[PDB]
Structure formats: structure tokens, C-alpha cells
Amino acid sequence: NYTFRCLQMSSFANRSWSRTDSVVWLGDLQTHRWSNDSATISFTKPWSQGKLSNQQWEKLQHMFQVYRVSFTRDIQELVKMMSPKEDYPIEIQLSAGCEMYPASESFLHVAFQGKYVVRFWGTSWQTVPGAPSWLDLPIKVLNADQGTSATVQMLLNDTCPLFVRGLLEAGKSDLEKQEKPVAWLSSVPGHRQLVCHVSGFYPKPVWVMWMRGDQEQQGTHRGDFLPNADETWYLQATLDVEAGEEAGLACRVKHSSLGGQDIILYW
Amino acid sequence: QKTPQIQVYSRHPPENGKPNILNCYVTQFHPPHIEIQMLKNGKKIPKVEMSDMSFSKDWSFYILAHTEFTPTETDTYACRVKHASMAEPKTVYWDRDM
Ligand SMILES: CCCCCCCC(=O)N[C@@H](CO[C@H]1O[C@H](CO)[C@H](O)[C@H](O)[C@H]1O)[C@H](O)[C@H](O)CCCC(=O)NCCCCCCc1ccccc1
Ligand SMILES: *[C@@H]1O[C@H](CO[C@@H]2O[C@@H](C)[C@@H](O)[C@@H](O)[C@@H]2O)[C@@H](O[C@@H]2O[C@H](CO)[C@@H](O)[C@H](O)[C@H]2NC(C)=O)[C@H](O)[C@H]1NC(C)=O
Ligand SMILES: CCCCCCCCCCCCCCCC(=O)O
Ligand SMILES: *[C@@H]1O[C@H](CO)[C@@H](O)[C@H](O)[C@H]1NC(C)=O
């Protein structure tokens, strides 16, 4: 299963300053970038056009080029219309895409000042429960635009899963790449914290544990997955130990890339 | 407004005198406007590369900064962030042992 996410970030500082920037992700790999600076969407993989022809891609891009301009104008007009009730600065985020199953489901969610307020669902825009009531009228106005409603329906129902099917084929060697973890041990300060660092692995699923022989040390505290700049992952796992009890401890790492041979480092 | 969290970590196992890459991963902030500096002995490192800003399921923003570095026994490295959520810049030091 892969989740395809198109993320739009728009900042409106005042009536004369705004920018809209977007990034696109297939699972954890970035496939596109669209800077406010650029007239066109940029591929960040060789395979970011998927299986769409140049014609299909250019049609899709043109639609987005029109949307970016129209969106910016629409938000600026709404803020003028509503001033001084709602005013600058304004942050709007959109998260749209689909999640693929062995079948697919699409989504389009919108946040205002960092809070989820609106989604597209079925054939119309809707405010979510608890959204500010001042959004109801502009959503009504947006729902009157049937041309936009039909386009969004096509994008979510048809284009998203289509496009993603082609990405999965075209990007197969990257999506299924295997990169090996490299691990190392260190410690920070009658107790101390031992740290097992694991870096450079892909794909994301990994197992890291402090061990005494074949006994898992349940004190093992796994950190978050942190990105490296070369599309691999970093993770560390710590263990608080009483001085004296450090002897006999090891860090064990399991990962798909290692061919059944776990890494084991001894403290 | 959400306050940025900062994590500083090396790409490869650190060995003194050996070129490496230092990462500064900044997360959980809002609004997206932010300034991120990486420092060597308290001085700004000029060649710092940034990923494209993105955001998580919870709508909070994240971004990765990184730079080439060669750790030594005596050099200190840090990542310093200015953001509207904080009156003072926040500095996190790299500690190879941490
Ligand atoms: C990611 C969604 C996919 C974008 C497809 C939009 C099609 C489009 O560009 N259409 C705009 C112009 O449409 C006009 O030309 C079309 C043909 O090119 C059709 O003929 C259409 O009938 C015609 O009107 C249109 O102006 C549209 O309103 C652009 C903005 C789209 C928009 O406010 N989408 C909702 C997402 C933001 C909602 C945020 C709600 C909100 C408001 C304020 C604060 C926070 C949140
Ligand atoms: C597009 O599909 C919707 C239903 O799909 C859901 O909403 C989409 C936006 C997307 O998020 C999907 O993953 C979701 O599963 C159709 O809307 C339905 O239409 C029927 C009648 O034909 C209606 O009775 C239902 O109430 C609608 N469903 C909902 C949940 O409201 C829509 O018509 C499709 N449009 C096109 C052009 O194909
Ligand atoms: C907005 C959701 C669209 C879903 C259909 C996916 C079609 C492929 C998208 C190609 C890259 C889009 C980059 C721009 C994203 C944006 O402006 O919101
Ligand atoms: C963003 O792009 C628009 C459209 O090209 C441009 O007019 C605007 O000045 C840009 N904003 C910034 C802050 O550069």
C-alpha cells in the first residue's frame, strides 16, 4: 500500500504579498516540487511523469497553473470582503491525494491557520463540525461553481489512482530499493544513557533493540524516524543503565537489506 | 503558533578528521516562516542545504537542513532556529555521544 500526497502551502502576509508552494510525495519519496518561483511543476525523480504522455501531463499542469492563480485571487478577495472580521497573516494548507489498496480511496482536506476546516467529499465541499461559521457562506459560493466541482471529482476519482498506478510502475527500482543500515554505539552521562545509532537504511521498516544475550532489554527507548538528505533514514535507540551493569550489553539491528544477517554491536 | 523541535545528528558514524554530513531536522512548527542556521564554533556555516518545506498529518511543518562537516576533538557544532513562536532563538548542540 502506498499513499500519494500532494501538499500545498499558501501564506498570505498582506494584500500585496503571498506565495504558494507545493510538494508531492509517494509514500516517503518526494516526486515533485512546485515553487512559487516556477511557472511549471518540477520532477524530483526521473519517473515523476509516471505513465502519462507529454500531452496528458501538460493538460494536467495547465489546469494546476490556472488553479494556482485563481486560488490566490479568490483568497485575496475573500479577505478584502471580510475585513476587518478575519485578517492577515493567513496560512492555508491543502492535502490531497489517494491511498492505493490491492482498489483506492481519495481525499482532499484543507486547513486554515493550522486547523482542519474543509474537505471535498463525494460531489461537494463541506465544512467539518466545529469549523468557524463564517466559512459556510464562502463554501456555498464555491459549491455553486459546478465546473470546479466536476474537475475535482475527476481528479480525485479518476486521475489520482490512474497517475499513481503509473508512478508505481515507472519508479519500481526506487520504490523497491534496499539500502543497508550502518550502526554505532555511544554514551552520554551513577547512571548513563547508551545510544545505538542506525543510519542510511531504506526502506523505513527496521528493528533495533538493546540485548543481553537473547534477552531483549525492555528499557530500550526508540526515537523517531529522522530523514537523511540522501533519501535514507536515521533512527536511534537509547538505554538507561546503572554503572557496572554495562558489561554484556549489545545493540541488535534487523533490516530487510541485510539478508537475514542482523547487525550486532557490543558495548 | 507551534514551537519548533530541533534534532541534530550525523549521517555516518563520526570519526575525527573524516568528512561527514551533519543534519538538523526541524519539526512541529507553525507558521512556516523560519530561519535555520548551522554553526561551527559559534560561527554560521555558509554552505547549508535545505530540503523543501513540507508538513505532517497534524498540519505542522518540517524541514531538513544539512551540511558537510569534519568533526574533530575540539570543534563544536550546533543548529540555531529563529521563529515567531519564540522570543529568543533556540540552539541545539550536536553531541556525538548523545
Ligand atoms: C486542489 C483542487 C483542484 C483545483 C481545481 C480547480 C479548478 C479551477 O481552477 N477553478 C477556478 C477557476 O475556475 C473557472 O475556470 C474553470 C475552467 O478553467 C471552470 O470553467 C470553472 O467553472 C470556472 O469558475 C475557481 O476560481 C476556483 O474557485 C479556484 C480556487 C479553488 C478553491 O478555492 N478550492 C477550494 C480549496 C480552498 C478552499 C479553502 C476554503 C477556505 C477559504 C478561506 C480560508 C480558509 C479556507
Ligand atoms: C466520484 O466519487 C464520488 C464518491 O466517492 C467518494 O468521494 C470522492 C470525492 C473520493 O474521495 C472517493 O475516494 C470517495 O469514495 C461520487 O459521489 C457519489 O455519487 C453517488 C451517485 O452517483 C451519490 O449518491 C453519493 O452520495 C456520492 N457519494 C458520496 C460519498 O457523497 C461522485 O459522483 C463521483 N464523480 C464522478 C465524476 O465520477
Ligand atoms: C490536488 C489533488 C490532485 C490529485 C490528482 C493527482 C494528479 C497528479 C498531480 C501532479 C503534481 C501536482 C502538484 C501540484 C499540487 C497542488 O498545487 O495542489
Ligand atoms: C509568488 O508567485 C506570484 C505569481 O507569479 C508572484 O506574483 C508573487 O510575487 C510571488 N510571491 C513572492 C513572495 O515571491
Numbering used by the authors:
A (entry chain A): 7 to 108, 111 to 197, 202 to 279
B (entry chain B): 2 to 99
From the manuscript:
Invariant natural killer T-cells (iNKT-cells) are a small set of glycolipid reactive T-cells that bridge innate and adaptive immunity. Structural data illustrated that the lipid chains of α-GalCer are bound in two hydrophobic pockets deeply buried in CD1d5, 6. The larger A’-pocket binds the fatty acid part while the linear F’-pocket accommodates the phytosphingosine chain.
To gain insights into the poor antigenic potency of the glycolipids but high affinity TCR binding, we determined the crystal structure of the CD1d/5d-complex as well as that of the complex of CD1d with compound 23, which resembles 5d but lacks the amide group. Surprisingly, galactosylsphingamide 5d is presented less well ordered by CD1d, as judged by the less contoured electron density. This slight disorder of the galactose presentation correlates well with the increase in the H-bond distance between CD1d and 5d. Especially the 2”-OH interaction with CD1d Asp153 is increased compared to 23 (3.0 vs. 2.6 Å), while the 3’-OH of phytosphingosine is also less intimately contacted by CD1d Asp80 (3.1 vs. 2.5 Å). We next compared the precise presentation of both ligand headgroups by CD1d. When looking down into the binding groove of CD1d (TCR view), we noticed lack of the F’-roof closure by 5d, while 23 induced the F’-roof formation. This is likely the result of the amide group perturbing the hydrophobic nature of the F’-pocket in general. Since the only difference between both glycolipids is the presence (5d) or absence of the amide group, this indicates that the amide is indeed responsible for the slight elevation of the galactose but more importantly for the failure in closure of the F’ roof in the binary complex, the latter of which is likely the main reason for the low antigenicity of the α-galactosylsphingamides. Biological evaluation revealed that the novel α-galactosylsphingamides are weak iNKT-cell antigens and that the main compromising factor is the implemented amide functionality.
